Write a protein that holds these residues in place. Structure first.
Motif, PDB file in Angstrom:
ATOM      1  N   UNK A  13       0.803  -1.216   0.000  1.00  0.00           N
ATOM      2  CA  UNK A  13       0.000   0.000   0.000  1.00  0.00           C
ATOM      3  C   UNK A  13       0.839   1.270   0.000  1.00  0.00           C
ATOM      4  N   UNK A  14       2.167   1.151  -0.085  1.00  0.00           N
ATOM      5  CA  UNK A  14       3.063   2.276   0.190  1.00  0.00           C
ATOM      6  C   UNK A  14       2.743   3.488  -0.678  1.00  0.00           C
ATOM      7  N   UNK A  15       2.668   3.295  -1.996  1.00  0.00           N
ATOM      8  CA  UNK A  15       2.446   4.438  -2.874  1.00  0.00           C
ATOM      9  C   UNK A  15       1.083   5.074  -2.617  1.00  0.00           C
ATOM     10  N   UNK A  16       0.052   4.253  -2.397  1.00  0.00           N
ATOM     11  CA  UNK A  16      -1.269   4.802  -2.113  1.00  0.00           C
ATOM     12  C   UNK A  16      -1.267   5.604  -0.817  1.00  0.00           C
ATOM     13  N   UNK A  17      -0.588   5.099   0.215  1.00  0.00           N
ATOM     14  CA  UNK A  17      -0.586   5.796   1.500  1.00  0.00           C
ATOM     15  C   UNK A  17       0.195   7.100   1.424  1.00  0.00           C
ATOM     16  N   UNK A  18       1.317   7.104   0.703  1.00  0.00           N
ATOM     17  CA  UNK A  18       2.067   8.342   0.512  1.00  0.00           C
ATOM     18  C   UNK A  18       1.249   9.364  -0.267  1.00  0.00           C
ATOM     19  N   UNK A  19       0.440   8.901  -1.229  1.00  0.00           N
ATOM     20  CA  UNK A  19      -0.429   9.816  -1.962  1.00  0.00           C
ATOM     21  C   UNK A  19      -1.441  10.475  -1.033  1.00  0.00           C
ATOM     22  N   UNK A  20      -2.042   9.690  -0.131  1.00  0.00           N
ATOM     23  CA  UNK A  20      -2.944  10.263   0.858  1.00  0.00           C
ATOM     24  C   UNK A  20      -2.212  11.266   1.739  1.00  0.00           C
ATOM     25  N   UNK A  21      -0.998  10.923   2.181  1.00  0.00           N
ATOM     26  CA  UNK A  21      -0.249  11.830   3.044  1.00  0.00           C
ATOM     27  C   UNK A  21       0.106  13.126   2.326  1.00  0.00           C
ATOM     28  N   UNK A  74       7.576   4.837   6.154  1.00  0.00           N
ATOM     29  CA  UNK A  74       8.431   5.701   6.963  1.00  0.00           C
ATOM     30  C   UNK A  74       9.601   6.241   6.139  1.00  0.00           C
ATOM     31  N   UNK A  75      10.044   7.445   6.494  1.00  0.00           N
ATOM     32  CA  UNK A  75      11.243   8.034   5.907  1.00  0.00           C
ATOM     33  C   UNK A  75      12.478   7.192   6.211  1.00  0.00           C
ATOM     34  N   UNK A  76      13.459   7.251   5.310  1.00  0.00           N
ATOM     35  CA  UNK A  76      14.776   6.736   5.646  1.00  0.00           C
ATOM     36  C   UNK A  76      15.330   7.484   6.854  1.00  0.00           C
ATOM     37  N   UNK A  77      16.157   6.791   7.636  1.00  0.00           N
ATOM     38  CA  UNK A  77      16.607   7.361   8.898  1.00  0.00           C
ATOM     39  C   UNK A  77      17.311   8.701   8.697  1.00  0.00           C
ATOM     40  N   UNK A  78      18.130   8.831   7.654  1.00  0.00           N
ATOM     41  CA  UNK A  78      18.839  10.096   7.490  1.00  0.00           C
ATOM     42  C   UNK A  78      17.961  11.205   6.921  1.00  0.00           C
ATOM     43  N   UNK A  79      16.707  10.917   6.582  1.00  0.00           N
ATOM     44  CA  UNK A  79      15.751  11.939   6.185  1.00  0.00           C
ATOM     45  C   UNK A  79      14.855  12.376   7.334  1.00  0.00           C
ATOM     46  N   UNK A  80      15.016  11.803   8.476  1.00  0.00           N
ATOM     47  CA  UNK A  80      14.328  12.239   9.679  1.00  0.00           C
ATOM     48  C   UNK A  80      15.193  13.245  10.425  1.00  0.00           C
ATOM     49  N   UNK A  95       5.102  17.829   9.186  1.00  0.00           N
ATOM     50  CA  UNK A  95       4.501  16.509   9.323  1.00  0.00           C
ATOM     51  C   UNK A  95       5.475  15.421   8.887  1.00  0.00           C
ATOM     52  N   UNK A  96       5.567  14.363   9.688  1.00  0.00           N
ATOM     53  CA  UNK A  96       6.342  13.182   9.345  1.00  0.00           C
ATOM     54  C   UNK A  96       5.418  12.052   8.919  1.00  0.00           C
ATOM     55  N   UNK A  97       5.955  11.148   8.095  1.00  0.00           N
ATOM     56  CA  UNK A  97       5.090  10.161   7.459  1.00  0.00           C
ATOM     57  C   UNK A  97       4.354   9.309   8.485  1.00  0.00           C
ATOM     58  N   UNK A  98       5.025   8.919   9.581  1.00  0.00           N
ATOM     59  CA  UNK A  98       4.323   8.081  10.553  1.00  0.00           C
ATOM     60  C   UNK A  98       3.265   8.869  11.320  1.00  0.00           C
TER      61      UNK A  98
END
Ligand SMILES: NCCC[C@@H](C(=O)O)N1CCC1=O
Length: 325
Positions: A13-21, A74-80, A95-98
């Protein structure tokens, strides 16, 4: 172990959830009510399989008492950013993805709720270690955070605690323990169940709600339907006085220990805890103060049952303290 249905792999569901976010307000704390309204619109557009799993769990919980979503985007660790070291969070924090997942998945379930005296009355809590943490604090690390039903002593106790992981601890040692009353009940003799059920017992409150004033609340360890009861348990705060009550609670405590399951949260995991039928804990880990310490996001969800709501409430409301009596 947990049932097959209790773990939901959301990787597809990753792409769909990122689209909602991508359509949610980027600075949520500037207008939290509008942010959560946007998240409610998105909640209706969740992938059908994920929406169904959430709705089924919401209807009456499960034997395990939790739902674990894995593989959220979730973002890659170095993007947090660096793990927070203070509460409350800055109002302008992007806003963060989680957090977006807590918003959308949370609104699928119910209404986000803050508690005025707790963490400055905020709705989104960062759960991170701090070096001087009080032993009851979710900022603990090296000392076990003992079993608790979240705010069991609060009249406006929430149906769900939701925990979304941006960083695990370095060694992936910290386990979130869940003790389900549906699993523990068969181990409790009928005589002890009868003593626990519908019996108010003195209960202390967490530090945020102390205005140590002692056992200013009354909590029923089991209540509701005697054949499928709700649970109110806090290993540190529940304070039965009568020897029979002390004994009955000790049996309940050992039963919850025996059936407890360990969930080790990793980035992209989101745990929904049925806070009317479980008690939860967090096992020890050693922080490193290096910018990458464990980092969860936590929200509380109210639903329209068990007198959580009385009319007109909105996601984002912050409520005042009232002890159960
Ligand atoms: N002992 C567990 C309580 C932890 C504590 C905290 O946020 O540190 N808490 C959740 C509601 C409340 O106060």
């Amino acid at each position: 172990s947990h049932m097959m249905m209790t773990v939901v792999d959301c990787s597809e569901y990753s792409a769909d959830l990122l689209a909602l976010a991508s359509r949610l307000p980027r600075i949520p704390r500037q207008d939290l009510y509008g942010f959560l309204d946007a998240a409610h619109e998105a909640a209706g557009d969740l992938p059908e399989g994920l929406g169904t799993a959430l709705d089924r769990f919401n209807a009456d919980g499960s034997h395990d008492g939790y739902l674990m979503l894995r593989g959220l985007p979730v973002e890659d660790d170095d993007d947090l950013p660096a793990t927070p070291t203070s509460t409350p969070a800055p109002v302008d924090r992007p806003l963060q993805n989680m957090e977006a997942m807590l918003a959308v998945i949370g609104r699928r379930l119910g209404l986000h709720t803050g508690y005025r005296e707790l963490r400055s009355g905020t709705v989104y809590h960062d759960v991170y270690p701090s070096p001087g943490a009080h032993h009851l604090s979710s900022e603990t690390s090296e000392t076990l955070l003992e079993f608790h039903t979240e705010m069991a002593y609060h009249v406006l106790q929430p149906n769900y605690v939701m925990l979304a992981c941006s960083r695990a601890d370095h060694e992936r040692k910290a386990a979130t323990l869940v003790g389900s009353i549906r699993k523990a009940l068969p181990l409790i003799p009928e005589e002890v169940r009868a003593r626990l059920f519908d019996r108010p017992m003195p209960c202390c409150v967490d530090v945020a709600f102390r205005g140590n004033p002692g056992a200013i609340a009354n909590v029923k360890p089991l209540y509701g339907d005697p054949r499928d009861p709700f649970l109110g348990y806090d290993r540190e705060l529940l304070a039965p006085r009568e020897p029979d009550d002390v004994e009955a609670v000790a049996v309940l405590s050992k039963a919850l220990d025996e059936v407890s399951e360990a969930v080790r949260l990793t980035p992209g995991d989101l745990l929904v805890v049925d806070n009317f039928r479980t008690t939860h804990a967090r096992t020890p880990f050693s922080p490193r103060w290096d910018g990458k310490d464990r980092w969860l996001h936590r929200v509380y969800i109210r639903t329209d049952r068990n007198d959580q709501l009385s009319g007109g409430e909105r996601a984002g409301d912050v409520v005042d303290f009232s002890p159960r009596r």
